[PDB]
Amino acid sequence: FTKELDQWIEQLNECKQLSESQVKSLCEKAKEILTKESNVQEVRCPVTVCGDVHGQFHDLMELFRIGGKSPDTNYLFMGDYVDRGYYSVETVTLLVALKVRYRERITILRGNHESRQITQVYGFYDECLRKYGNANVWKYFTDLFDYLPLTALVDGQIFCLHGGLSPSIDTLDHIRALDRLQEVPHEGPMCDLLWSDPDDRGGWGISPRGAGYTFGQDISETFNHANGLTLVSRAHQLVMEGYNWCHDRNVVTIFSAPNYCYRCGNQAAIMELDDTLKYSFLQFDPAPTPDYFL
Amino acid sequence: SLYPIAVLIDELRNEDVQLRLNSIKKLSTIALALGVERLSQSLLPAIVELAEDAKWRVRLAIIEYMPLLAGQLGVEFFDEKLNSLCMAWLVDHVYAIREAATSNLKKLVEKFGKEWAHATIIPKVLAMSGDPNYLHRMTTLFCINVLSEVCGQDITTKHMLPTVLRMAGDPVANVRFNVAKSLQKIGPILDNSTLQSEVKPILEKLTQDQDVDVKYFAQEALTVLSLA
Amino acid sequence: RDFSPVPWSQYFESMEDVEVENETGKDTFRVYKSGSEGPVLLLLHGGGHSALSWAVFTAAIISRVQCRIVALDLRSHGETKVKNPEDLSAETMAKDVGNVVEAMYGDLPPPIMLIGHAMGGAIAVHTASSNLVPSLLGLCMIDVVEGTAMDALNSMQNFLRGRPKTFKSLENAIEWSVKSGQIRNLESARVSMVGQVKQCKPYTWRIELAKTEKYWDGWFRGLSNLFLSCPIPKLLLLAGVDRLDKDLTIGQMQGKFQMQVLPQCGHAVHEDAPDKVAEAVATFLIRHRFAEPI
């Protein structure tokens, strides 16, 4: 089975999907591994933190050319593995295959995209349909997304998650207490961690995004100090540079999808944390129906 | 035939990445045009800066061109300008550069000889073994993987193997399983006396590692080396 | 069963022919009203349509939140008699919206949410941006995005001068709208299509919309950046992610507004899925506490 996995990886590296049957097995074992994982998954450095990838398979290959190959380089992904229906299948299937092959070598968190809600509507479900004929593969991945850990903690100091902070969570134990094994709710603590944004007006604000909360620097500083944290690292927001500091370096945003949706022109970035938790940022470029609105 | 250098240069420093990259894969023919003193100052300076161009693909285009260039300059003018360029790529921020730079040393040893390598190259490669960053510590092991192929039995055993075997006790698991992956690769290039009393005991220890991966690759190495 | 019409009085509680004065003379507008309390939802239809496009929506939304509905027949559309029906610039039509508000209330403008479809989407924005509604608390744009609308100009020029010129009867107009795919909801077609056509002579188009081509650039140009600059809670509803252009994609990934996709709809999404459009606007309203649920 270890060598079947190597075969699947080799294949996905050539952008060639696995069979419906194979996806099913992959997801079965992935559930089994991720069950043992915590809502606040303990990660030990050196790791490379990665933000949104958005089903952009080729730019993920680019990511690996920058940071290095798995399992040699340890990676921590902060969600949004799927987006539009072009190469989202290969992108997610690869990252899952890596996790199944190498439990200790990568961590894959849940993003707001890893949900039945968004996947049905953005493209992933359509891709599964065009590439498999049925949509069982959409079901095998969305059932799996329920098992992704929500947050991660690098050496008890650097806190990682897709979105941001919640008015319903003060401590890491609050996150640990949650039942994460479900479809992302529209309301409450779990939603917020996947949907919230850092913000330039102190305190809490109603999220213009539809779900979650905008949160200010005063909240970041409070949250970090109470949990003994030095940094909150998160994704979720497109940043033209790939990465961005805000809230006086209490928060960093890491967006890992270059030229998002093939039109934005943004850079991507990953954050390398060395053997002693020294940060360095690496920026990269991309790799080289009614028609009536009146 | 003395003016197209101005044209070639203009494009090598242009804004658009596309002109830069393709005109680079054009330097070989222009070197053979008339390049004894011309490459020295009329063209090498432009190559030197392109070695640290911010666009990693352009650094790749130089790295891959290096062996053909280092050829036409010769051994005696390599330790001069280009040795530092070659070494500094090993420690580049982009893995694909470090990786290309690794396989670049091999092509260099292919031209200049295993003796030249034992003097110039191998020590600077042994340095990265103590590097605080594990991404670099592993580059050492990737170089030893590449160098073992063209250095032969005696030189690999003497000046490379001890460094590999000493890395079996690295605090980072990613380094430890690259040790087991290295011995699998280099093992065939070692007499049977070295594999049994020097190598095998170390691989035996690694199978008892705390990490899932280090175990697996220590086992597979023993299998592939008929040791089992 | 039937393709026979359904009167507006099945969905709206009342109507009014609102009087408005300017430079050359006086104009009468026509609004269809429903509800007695809560915020007013000011509704602006697409090109060549009428307030009647919102008929079903209104019924669905009123039974969800305590709101009021003001569905406005824009100039040259529906039963709006204007001294100058040839001038259909973005500015003039937005000026009109503002004036209807003043003429109806002026002294007492109640909380207002703007909701615009297609053309009415661009006008809603131009109205919001110029701050012509002094109580406006929210803005909704339905199925219009600048980049794609600009890309569609020629093709919707083609559609129009492909349309049938006349209709044997109002029934045939209703039938044609479903059969052609203009409206995917027969209930909505039966009530809205009477605001699309008039009669004397067979039935013909209420507005020779092909004439308005000269004003189309002024409608959609800079609409994304304009929409993004209105510092109020915004909603954007699309039939698909394909509608997005560069500027709104960057905008939405930066969490600046809310987007729902309803891929089960054609272009007239409020006509095709009035149920779910009501639901989205309802949630929006309750969440920002602009309205109260039933």
Swiss-Prot record, chain A:
Q: What is its EC number?
A: 3.1.3.16
Q: Iron as a keyword?
A: yes
- Alphabetical list of SMART domains matching this protein: PP2Ac
**Any GO MF annotation of the entry:** GABA receptor binding
Q: Which reaction does it catalyse?
A: O-phospho-L-seryl-[protein] + H2O = L-seryl-[protein] + phosphate; O-phospho-L-threonyl-[protein] + H2O = L-threonyl-[protein] + phosphate
Tell me which cofactor or cofactors this protein depends on. Mn(2+); Fe(3+); Zn(2+)
Quick one: which residues bind Mn(2+) 1?
52, 54, 80
Q: What are the Leucine methyl ester sites (modified residues) in this protein?
A: 294
Residue numbers carrying Phosphotyrosine: 292
Consequence recorded when altering residue 55 to V: In HJS3; uncertain significance
Phenotype when changing residue 80 to N: Loss of phosphatase activity
A Gene Ontology BP annotation from the UniProt entry: regulation of microtubule polymerization
Q: Where does Mn(2+) 2 bind?
A: 80, 112, 162, 236
Predominant location category: cytoplasm
GO cellular component terms, alphabetically, are: chromatin; chromosome, centromeric region; cytosol; extracellular exosome; FAR/SIN/STRIPAK complex; INTAC complex; membrane; membrane raft
Q: What is the effect of changing residue 294 to A?
A: Loss of binding to PP2A B-alpha regulatory subunit
What InterPro entries has UniProt attached to this entry? Calcineurin-like_PHP_ApaH, Metallo-depent_PP-like, PPA2-like, Ser/Thr-sp_prot-phosphatase
PTM comment: Reversibly methyl esterified on Leu-294 by leucine carboxyl methyltransferase 1 (LCMT1) and protein phosphatase methylesterase 1 (PPME1). Carboxyl methylation influences the affinity of the catalytic subunit for the different regulatory subunits, thereby modulating the PP2A holoenzyme's substrate specificity, enzyme activity and cellular localization. Phosphorylation of either threonine (by autophosphorylation-activated protein kinase) or tyrosine results in inactivation of the phosphatase. Auto-dephosphorylation has been suggested as a mechanism for reactivation.
Result for mutant: residue 83 to G: In HJS3; loss of phosphatase activity in an in vitro assay; strong decrease in C-terminal methylation; decreased interaction with PP2A subunit A PPP2R1A/PPP2R1B; loss of interaction with PP2A subunit B component PPP2R2A; decreased interaction with PP2A subunit B components PPP2R5A, PPP2R5B, PPP2R5E, PPP2R3A and STRN3
Q: Read off the Pfam families from this record.
A: Metallophos
Describe the family membership recorded for this protein in Swiss-Prot or TrEMBL: Belongs to the PPP phosphatase family. PP-1 subfamily.
Name assigned to this protein: Serine/threonine-protein phosphatase 2A catalytic subunit alpha isoform
Q: Which organism is it from?
A: Homo sapiens (Human)
Q: Which gene encodes it?
A: PPP2CA
Swiss-Prot record, chain B:
Relate the outcome reported for changing residue 109 to A.
In HJS2; uncertain significance; does not affect interaction with PPP2R5D and PPP2CA
HEAT repeats sit at: 1-38, 39-77, 78-116, 117-155, 156-194, 195-228
> What is the protein name stated in its UniProt record?
Serine/threonine-protein phosphatase 2A 65 kDa regulatory subunit A alpha isoform
State the disulfide connectivity: none
Leader sequence segment: none
What species was this sequence derived from? Homo sapiens
Q: What does this protein do?
A: The PR65 subunit of protein phosphatase 2A serves as a scaffolding molecule to coordinate the assembly of the catalytic subunit and a variable regulatory B subunit. Upon interaction with GNA12 promotes dephosphorylation of microtubule associated protein TAU/MAPT. Required for proper chromosome segregation and for centromeric localization of SGO1 in mitosis. Together with RACK1 adapter, mediates dephosphorylation of AKT1 at 'Ser-473', preventing AKT1 activation and AKT-mTOR signaling pathway. Dephosphorylation of AKT1 is essential for regulatory T-cells (Treg) homeostasis and stability.
Region (PP2A subunit C binding) residue ranges read 39-228
Give the multimer and partner information. Answer: PP2A consists of a common heterodimeric core enzyme, composed of PPP2CA a 36 kDa catalytic subunit (subunit C) and PPP2R1A a 65 kDa constant regulatory subunit (PR65 or subunit A), that associates with a variety of regulatory subunits. Proteins that associate with the core dimer include three families of regulatory subunits B (the R2/B/PR55/B55, R3/B''/PR72/PR130/PR59 and R5/B'/B56 families), the 48 kDa variable regulatory subunit, viral proteins, and cell signaling molecules. Found in a complex with at least ARL2, PPP2CB, PPP2R1A, PPP2R2A, PPP2R5E and TBCD. (Microbial infection) Interacts with JC virus small t antigen; this interaction inhibits PPP2R1A activity.
Q: Which family does it belong to?
A: Belongs to the phosphatase 2A regulatory subunit A family.
User: Which domain of life does this protein belong to?
Assistant: Eukaryota
Q: Where in the cell is it found?
A: Cytoplasm; Nucleus; Chromosome; Chromosome, Centromere
Swiss-Prot record, chain C:
Q: How is it modified after translation?
A: Phosphorylated by SIK1 following increases in intracellular sodium, leading to dissociation from the protein phosphatase 2A (PP2A) complex and subsequent dephosphorylation of sodium/potassium-transporting ATPase ATP1A1.
Give the family this protein belongs to, as stated in its UniProt record.
Belongs to the AB hydrolase superfamily.
Q: One Pfam family name from the record?
A: Abhydrolase_6
Q: What positions constitute the catalytic site?
A: 118, 143, 267
> According to the UniProt record, what class of enzyme is this?
hydrolase
Alphabetized InterPro entries for the sequence: AB_hydrolase_1, AB_hydrolase_fold, PPase_methylesterase_euk
From the record, give the cysteines joined by S-S bonds: none
Quaternary state and partners of this protein? Binds PPP2CA and PPP2CB.
Q: Mention any one GO cellular component term assigned to this protein in its UniProt record.
A: nucleoplasm
Q: Does the keyword Hydrolase apply?
A: yes
Q: One MF term from GO for this chain?
A: protein phosphatase inhibitor activity
Q: Which residues carry this modification: Phosphoserine?
A: 4
Q: What is this protein called?
A: Protein phosphatase methylesterase 1
UniProt xrefs under SUPFAM superfamilies: alpha/beta-Hydrolases
Summarizing the function annotation, the protein's role is: Demethylates proteins that have been reversibly carboxymethylated. Demethylates PPP2CB (in vitro) and PPP2CA. Binding to PPP2CA displaces the manganese ion and inactivates the enzyme.
EC number per UniProt: 3.1.1.89
Record's keyword terms, sorted: Hydrolase, Methylation, Phosphoprotein, Serine esterase
Going by the entry's taxonomy, the superkingdom of the source organism is recorded as: Eukaryota
Q: Which reaction does it catalyse?
A: [phosphatase 2A protein]-C-terminal L-leucine methyl ester + H2O = [phosphatase 2A protein]-C-terminal L-leucine + methanol + H(+)
Q: Which GO terms describe its biological process?
A: G2/M transition of mitotic cell cycle
